[PDB]
Amino acid sequence: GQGFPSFLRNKIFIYRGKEYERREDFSLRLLTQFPNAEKMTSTTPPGEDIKSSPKQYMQCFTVKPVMSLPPSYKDKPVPEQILNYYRANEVQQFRYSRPFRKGEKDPDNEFATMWIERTTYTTAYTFPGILKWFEVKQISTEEISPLENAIETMELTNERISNCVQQHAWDRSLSVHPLSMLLSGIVDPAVMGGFSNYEKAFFTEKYLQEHPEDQEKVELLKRLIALQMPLLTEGIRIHGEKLTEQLKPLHERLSSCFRELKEKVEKHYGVITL
């Protein structure tokens, strides 16, 4: 909008909100800070008319705090506390995942069109600072193919498993409910089978005329699930270390389906495991 002051018109900031502000709570708080409190709905782009029009327009959304790079820690087997500190503070880089449809919108499947146009955000200073907000100094966007999309989703799930495994691995007096949560969800891509979704998406030769030269990515995913397999194995064994009788039918389902996916990736997906 244009009613905004000189330093605010057509300007994008990032706000270091409170520890647990839900997005619209902070939105409302800002609306208190500003009359003519409306929200443009096209969260991604600006409005060219509103690039000059009066009637100040704003939009808010949570962003991803890109991890720090703790120096001299990049391979050290450090505990988690230091990195969790580094997950929030001393930060300038910020990405936002952008859903998009690119391809055919087949009913049973969405990865025919999943494209993530992430936008990185680099601000001049490091949160936290003297001011609890800062304009984004440099803006840049990105792209993610459904191949690539499967990639980040895959790998992020793998680490999420790793993080839960280590956090329970150091502390025994720790609830098993998250293990039920995660291992249940992993075992059943219930509402939709992600694994067979990737099979139809890239493993099938159809993609390999869609992406003949871009089959060096299906092998990436194959190795990714190959490296998945032991991670699920730690998940299963830690579950067993935390197993209970209510989890016992749960555990045997996990275990049976675990060797199922084991043999499947070994022969059905044909991937070579370590």
Binding site: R22, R23, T43, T62, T153, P178, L182, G185, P189, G194
Partner: peptide, 19 residues
């Protein structure tokens, strides 16, 4: 905390949060 009509559908269930 997704913007309306902007959620990414994951492949797994049983969500959680710290509130």
């Amino acid at each position: 905390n997704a913007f309306p009509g902007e959620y990414i559908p994951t492949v797994f269930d049983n969500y959680s949060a710290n509130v």
